[PDB]
């Protein structure tokens, strides 16, 4: 019935399992030794019997033989079962490509988590109130300080596909990028800057893509004074519901376009996509000039209809 | 309900139990009390049982009464045991550690002191109850109190300690906590931390046995690392217990082989391989001792060397 | 030589100014209680934020010979070190770690020497429980008022000790200077073994009286 | 004569400046916002840290006749007495203890008079539960605008009443002054016994009307 009491009183599950274990061990020692030295049982039997006695089964294969045995056993049982029940309750309490990590929680990471609904996402933030909002978005919550390496390794940073750092300031964003490069110097870090001056410090600390939102926003609120078509183009090609989308198409090896210049290929006339740029590794040539010959490995940045996108992939293929 | 109601009900049943088995079965009190327990315990070992309609009646009645009062008494007991432990976790009394160590104040200096003091009993006396989680994660006991109170310094058992480590927020409270310890026990060892160079002679006159100034040490390693930083590379590496060479100190025993001989005729570096940076007798230290220095008994040789070389030194200085 | 910039004002950058007498110091901090303390210590005061690159160039970081970064937090010390590494990519940065876990991260940011005062004093507090001769040796060889001073003497190119091993020299038996370590480049070998051989450019970390140090500078001369 | 240094600004030191009108008073406090409140009372402000020995010699502790210490805690009040006693070993220090257990620690540090306001308040609180005449006595004889004044009249060398006991002198009938004590050096005998004879240069602490105080000084004159 003590187990009923334990269910009635989970309210007292306040102490370490280590205290619980030491105390139960002391009891089984008392029990086993008395069976060996008072009852005269072997050690195999004394322990067996002690367990059976503590657990309150008492089969009767072994039973106390003397008043001392009876006095001894009464003590053994009355204390042991209480402890046993406690130990059992604590055990029950305990018993019952890759992922991307997001360090911090803000409005930039809430809208990023809408497009990552397929993948596995771990969100590492030290505040406890943001636990409810991560589970609504289908992502696992890891509680800890994101600038700490002892809590970054809890969030599985070492085997991540990419890590996204968006913290409260640029002092903590830099202190978090250098803690990820302490774990591995190969994972992709995508960082966000609050100020325009700290863009080069975030690149020196180790970020691979720095996205400054208030510099884009400040440079769209000065072009929208006359006509707001610049802020209407940027906020439309990024929406996944839109008719035209800005996608990337890689050129495979031995392609029909390798060595062909952009006026010798005529991509927009045949396929129908608009070549706004072409990226070669970690750079990007926007509006490529006349003498730009293609290669196997370049990534083509274009805008077109989805019925025009597959025509571009079926054309440049080897 | 009063705790005494719960207890009296428990007692009433064991009496009932023991007496009825005697009156119905004719069994002795030893077995009657025991059997009652056996049924309450729900174990049933198979020795005693009722053998009459009334005994069976009695026994069933008894079991119901027994378990009911028992279970209540037990849950109260368990609650008391938890409450006592919870108070201990918060911290209240100190269990007479013969050599325990008391740490007055929680900062970043005393946190790296607690990584080297593993195994020994360490009590941490601090005013903020927020740092209760950090202390028990490092294996130290926490005592919630104000360390500048003599009524609260005795709660951490300062009188029986082997050393007290004082690092409070300012130098005003570090002197006040030292002055409070020197009237509780005027013979315990106080290691204290000075934040200003003005107060090093003030902490020492109040009763501190060793005053450590981390802003004067670091302020002198920063002005010496401008040209070449080999002075700060040496200091920060002989204190770490993960390097190759380790700075330890060995004492000179009574009746040794070196009692009376000068340093030059001793050749401690040539035989043993241990660099003897200084020797200390009592409460002073002589760094780079001259060649006419005569060793006496009770000396302490401070040296640097590999742990293979320190054992070679100890057999050479033995009696 | 040249001037020394100090970013941030604390109790350890105040004790550093007592040994920078005879040089030129620019301190970069906040105005509200610091400008009177700095001018009473023989240094200039440049009001600005040391984490901001437009205020680091007012304090003449680009032409300095050492920058000393002691800010309030270990996230603002990192943010100031990466601001120095944009102006001058080669100047010496002596940083200071407030916590032990950030020591490896202040070296990635660009500091050339990371002092850690609370790991040193936390390791001298636990070695003074029995007897405190470890704490009395550190705080004595650094003060310039004592008798024996920890100095460092460089071995010149084409010298009488170049190529000579430490067994063949016995520098303590001839000069009276304890050779507690030999530094080559950016690495230090504390208590070098008997099979070590000197080069041209090694620096000898040693402890001795100023009579003995000048006897060592003539013993390694050619 | 000389000036008075007051360390720390609080409600106890604001009420001390109301009776120190007409003397030079220097107030050494760490807050800058109290510069208007100090200067309004006729006291020259000196901005500094009172627990620092450098900012204690700014306020001219040496040429002072009394130093009144009242800081935010009993730790900083002990630390300030330990700094004045390095500078001036013979100046008079008046200190203010908060706790009862610190009265002997402020007194061993070097304070000549320790006033504990929280113990006098706790004594008069538990003595006003039945009849509050004891609290009304203390807060009336200390007022500067009351009918009776508690004074100190010293015995000059060569006085009429040298050697005379307190019984045969009969001070209360001739003068009117209630004799509630005789001070000899640094001790006070409240309710002196009848066999206690007088001595040269011994103070008589007493209460009386201001027309009765002037009749006492002629009764004890030469």
Give SS3 for A230: helix
Q: Does one domain contain both D54 and D39?
A: yes
Quote the CA–CA distance of B33 and D177 in Å, as a whole number: 85
Tell whether C29 and C126 lie within a shared domain. Answer: no
Give me B202's structure tokens. 């003030």
CB contact under 8 A, A182 and C105: yes
Query: Which residues in B have their CB inside 8 Å of a CB on D?
Result: 148-151, 170-173, 175-176, 179-180, 198, 202
N-terminal to C-terminal alpha carbon distance within chain B: 72
Taking the CB of residue A18, how many other CB atoms lie within 10 A of it?
8
Confirm whether residue A308 is marked as ligand binding: no
- Distances from the Cα of C205 to the Cα of B93, B143, C153, C160, angstroms: 50, 45, 7, 18
Position B24 in a domain:
yes
Q: Tell whether D62 and D11 lie within a shared domain.
A: yes
Q: Are B35 and A73 a contacting pair, CB within 8 Å?
A: no
Q: Per the CB < 8 Å rule, is C78 touching A172?
A: no
C-alpha of A297 from chain center: 31
- Please state at what angle helix A43-54 crosses helix A17-34, rounded to 10 degrees: 120
Question: Looking at chain C, which subunits does it touch, using at least 3 CB pairs closer than 8 Å as the criterion?
Answer: A, B
Distance from CA of D170 to the nearest CA of B (A): 47
Q: Considering Cα of B192, then B196, then B201, then B202, what sign does the dihedral take?
A: negative
**The Cα angle at residue D92 between residues D86 and D94, in degrees rounded to 5:** 105
- Could you give the maximum distance between any two Cα atoms of chain D, in Å? 59
**A286 lies in some domain:** yes
How many angstroms separate the CA atoms of A128 and A314, rounded?
A: 50
Q: CB distance B75–A1 less than 8 Å?
A: no
- Coil/strand/helix, residue D149: strand
Could you tell me if D81 and D106 are in contact, meaning their C-beta atoms sit under 8 angstroms apart?
Answer: yes
Spell out the long-range contacts of A148-152 with Cβ–Cβ below 8 A and sequence spacing 24 or more.
A148/A179, A148/C101, A149/A179, A149/A182, A149/A183, A149/C101, A150/C101, A151/A124, A152/A103, A152/A124, A152/A176, A152/A179, A152/A180, A152/A183
Of A9, A56, A82, the CB nearest to B43: A56
Residues of chain B with Cβ-Cβ distance to C126 below 8 Å are 113, 116-117
**Cβ-contact C77, C106 below 8 angstroms:** yes
Tell if the CB–CB gap between B74 and A53 is shorter than 8 Å.
no
The verdict on C106 and C16 lying in the same domain is yes
Does chain A touch chain B (at least 3 C-beta pairs within 8 Å)?
yes
- The residue of chain B nearest to residue C184, with distances taken between CA atoms, is B230
Quick check: is B48 in a domain? yes
Please state, as a whole number, how many other Cβ atoms lie within 10 Å of the Cβ of residue A136.
Answer: 9
Three-class DSSP category at B102: strand
Whether residue B166 is contained in a domain is answered as yes
Residues B139, B141, B143, CA angle at the centre, nearest 5°?
155
Looking at the fold, whether A201 and A266 belong to one and the same domain comes out as no
| D51, D54, D105 member nearest B172 (Cβ) | D51
What is the SS3 assignment for D84?
helix
Reference C96, options B215, A118, A291; nearest CA is: B215
Clarify whether residues D92 and D179 are in a common domain: no
Query: Is A9 a domain residue?
Result: no
Reduce the DSSP state of residue C15 to 3 states and report it.
coil
**What's the CA gap between D54 and B278, in Å, rounded?**
36
Give the CATH number, domain containing residue C129. Answer: 1.20.5.870
Closest CB to A204: pick one of C73, C85, C102.
C85
**Separation of alpha carbons B88 and B92, rounded Å:** 6
CA proximity to B240, closest of C182, C100, C184 = C100
Residues of C in contact with B224 (CB under 8 A): 19, 142
Chosen domain end from D96, D127, D144: D144
- Report yes or no: C189 and C179 within 8 Å, Cβ to Cβ: no
Alpha helices in A1-42 (DSSP H): 2-8, 17-34
Distance from CA of B29 to the nearest CA of A (A): 11
Phi, psi of C73 (to 5 degrees): -110, 165
Burial class of residue B302, CB neighbours in 10 A (0-12, 13-18, 19+): buried
User: Does C125 contact B196 at a Cβ distance shorter than 8 Å?
Assistant: no
Using CA of residue C201, residue C204, residue C205, residue C208, what is the dihedral sign?
negative
Residue with tokens 């004093």: C121
The closest CB to that of B175, out of D54, D73, D79, belongs to D79
Using CA of residue A298, residue A302, residue A307, residue A311, what is the dihedral sign? negative
Q: B163: domain CATH number?
A: 3.40.50.720
Question: What's the domain count of chain B?
Answer: 4
Instruction: For residues C38 and C54, state if they share a domain.
Output: yes
Taking residue A209's Cβ as centre, other Cβ atoms within 10 Å add up to 14
Q: Is residue B313 part of a domain?
A: yes
How far is the first Cα of chain C from the last one, in angstroms, to the nearest whole number?
Answer: 27
B216 in Cβ contact with B197 (< 8 Å): yes
Q: How many CB pairs under 8 A join B and C?
A: 213
Report residue C216 as tokens: 């060592």
B and C touch per CB criterion (3+ pairs under 8 A): yes
Say how many CA atoms lie within 13 Å of A85 toward its Cβ. 20
**Residue positions of D in the annotated binding site?**
70, 96, 98
Does the beta-carbon distance from B222 to C16 stay under 8 Å? yes
Q: Which domain holds residue A224?
A: 213-240
Report phi then psi at A49, rounded to 5. Answer: -60, -45
Let me know if residue A10 belongs to a domain. Answer: no
Residue of C nearest to B302 (CA): C133
Other Cβ atoms within 10 Å of B241 Cβ, number: 8
Strands C187-190 and B284-287: unpaired
> Do A239 and A284 touch, CB atoms closer than 8 A?
no
B6 and B39 within one domain:
yes
Say which residue the tokens 């106080």 belong to.
B190
Nearest Cα neighbor of D49 from B201, B198, B193 is: B198
| Strand residue runs (E) in chain B | 101-104, 122-126, 141-144, 163-166, 189-193, 210-212, 246-251, 275-281, 284-287, 300-305
Strands of B284-287's sheet in order across: B246-251, B300-305, B275-281, B284-287
Question: Subunits with at least 3 CB pairs below 8 A relative to chain B?
Answer: A, C, D
Residue A217 zone, left/alpha/beta (φ > 0; ψ -120 to 50; rest): alpha
Q: Is D159 helix (H, G, I), strand (E, B) or coil?
A: coil
> Using CB atoms, which residue from B162, B196, B213 is nearest to C129?
B162
Nearest to C181 by CA among C171, C191, C167: C191
What method did the depositors use to determine the structure? cryo-EM
Contact B31 A70 (CB under 8 A): yes
Q: Quick one: residue B284, left, alpha or beta (phi over 0 = left, psi -120 to 50 = alpha)?
A: beta
Distance (Å, rounded) from C-alpha D138 to C-alpha D127?
12
Tell me how far CA of residue B210 lies from CA of B12, B175, B298, D41, in angstroms: 64, 13, 20, 46
CA D67/CA D87 separation, integer angstroms:
12
Which residues in chain B have Cβ-Cβ distances shorter than 8 Å to A74?
34, 37
Out of A172, A182, A201, the one facing C75 most closely (by C-beta) is A172
Q: What angle do CA D86, D88, D92 make, to 5 degrees?
A: 120
Can you say whether residue A57 is alpha, beta or left, with left for phi > 0 and alpha for psi between -120 and 50 degrees? alpha
d(CA A290, CA D25): 86
CATH code assigned at B29: 1.10.287.70
Strand partners, A122: A101, A140
List residues in chain B touching A: CB distance below 8 A.
30-31, 34, 37-38, 41-47, 67, 71, 74-75, 77-79, 82, 85-86, 89
- Using an 8 Å Cβ cutoff, are C96 and C117 in contact? yes
Annotated ligand binding at C98? The verdict is: yes
Question: Whole-angstrom Cα distance, residue A201 to residue C75?
Answer: 13
Chain A: nearest CA to B318, how far in angstroms? 43
Q: Which two tokens stand for residue B247?
A: 């700075």
3-class secondary structure per residue, B234-290: HHHHHCCCCCCCEEEEEECCCCCCCCCCEHHHHCHHHHCCCEEEEEEECCEEEECCC
Axis-axis angle for helices C117-125, B230-238 (nearest 10): 40
**Do residues B100 and B120 make contact, with C-beta atoms less than 8 angstroms apart?**
yes
Interchain CB distance below 8 Å, C120 and B189:
no
Binding site of D for Ca(2+), by residue number, is: 70, 96, 98
Strands B300-305, B246-251: pairing is antiparallel
Give dist(CA D30, CA D8) in Å, integer.
7
Of A65, A95, A125, which closes a domain? A95
The vertex-A308 CA angle with A305 and A310, nearest 5°, equals 115
Q: Which residue of C has its CA nearest to B238?
A: C190
* Assigned domain for A1 exists: no
Residues A91 and A147 in one domain: no
Query: Contact, C205 vs C181, CB < 8 A?
Result: yes
- Whether A14 sits inside 8 A of B82 (CB atoms) is yes
The residue to which tokens 């050129």 are assigned: A251
**If you compute the radius of gyration of chain C from its CA atoms, what whole number of angstroms results?**
20
CB contact under 8 A, B45 and A57: no
A198 CB neighbours in chain C (<8 A) are 79
User: Do residue A115 and residue A154 come from a single domain?
Assistant: yes
Q: CA C5, CA C70: separation in Å to the nearest integer? A: 11
Cα A163 to Cα A153: distance, rounded to the nearest angstrom: 12
Please give the sequence-ordered ranges of beta strands (E in DSSP) within A113-227, or none if there are none. Answer: 121-125, 140-143, 162-165, 188-192, 209-211
Residue D79 — left, alpha, or beta (φ > 0 → left; ψ -120 to 50 → alpha)? alpha
Query: Which of B219, B236, B246 is the best substitution to test chain C (most C C-beta atoms within 10 A)?
Result: B219
Judge if B199 and B128 occupy the same domain.
yes
Task: Give yes or no for a contact between D148 and D209, defined as CB atoms under 8 angstroms apart.
Answer: yes
Q: Which residue in C has a C-alpha nearest to residue B194's C-alpha?
A: C121
Q: Are B198 and D101 within 8 A, CB to CB?
A: no
CA distances in angstroms from C51 to A19, B234, C7, C77, listed in the order given: 49, 30, 9, 8
Are B156 and B180 contained in the same domain?
Answer: yes
What the block records as the tokens of A73 is: 């056993």
Out of A66, A95, A124, pick the residue that ends a domain: A95
Are C15 and B305 a contacting pair at CB < 8 A? no
């Amino acid at each position: 019935v003590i187990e009923i009491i334990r269910k009635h009183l989970p309210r007292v599950l306040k102490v370490p399992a280590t205290r619980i274990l030491l105390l139960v061990l002391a009891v089984i020692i008392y029990g086993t030794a008395g069976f060996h030295f008072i009852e005269g049982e072997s050690w195999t039997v004394s322990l067996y019997w002690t367990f059976v006695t503590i657990a309150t089964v008492g089969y009767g294969d072994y039973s106390p033989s003397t008043p001392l045995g009876m006095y001894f056993t009464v003590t053994l049982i009355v204390l042991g079962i209480g402890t046993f029940a406690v130990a059992v309750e604590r055990l029950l309490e305990f018993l019952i490509s890759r992922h991307v990590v997001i360090c911090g929680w803000s409005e930039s990471t809430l809208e990023c988590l809408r497009e990552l609904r397929g993948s596995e996402v771990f969100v590492l933030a030290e505040d406890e109130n943001v636990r409810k909002k991560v589970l609504r978005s289908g992502a696992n919550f890891v509680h800890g300080d994101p600038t700490r390496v002892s809590d970054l390794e809890k969030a599985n940073v070492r085997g991540a596909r990419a890590v996204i750092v968006d913290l409260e300031s640029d002092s903590e964003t830099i202190h978090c990028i250098l803690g990820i490069r302490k774990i591995d110097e190969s994972v992709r870090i995508i960082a966000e800057a609050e100020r325009y001056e700290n863009i080069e410090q975030l690149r020196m600390a180790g970020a691979d893509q720095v996205i400054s939102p208030f510099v884009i926003s400040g440079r769209l609120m000065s072009r929208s004074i006359d006509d707001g078509y610049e802020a209407m183009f940027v906020q439309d090609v990024l929406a996944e519901e839109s008719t035209r989308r800005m996608v990337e198409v890689p050129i495979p090896e031995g392609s029909k376009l390798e060595g062909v210049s952009v006026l010798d290929a005529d991509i927009h006339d045949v396929t129908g996509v608009i070549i706004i740029g072409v990226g070669r590794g970690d750079e990007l040539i926007i509006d490529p000039p006349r003498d730009y010959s293609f290669r196997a490995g370049d990534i083509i940045l274009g805008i077109g209809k989805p019925e025009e996108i597959e025509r571009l992939k079926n054309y440049i293929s080897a």
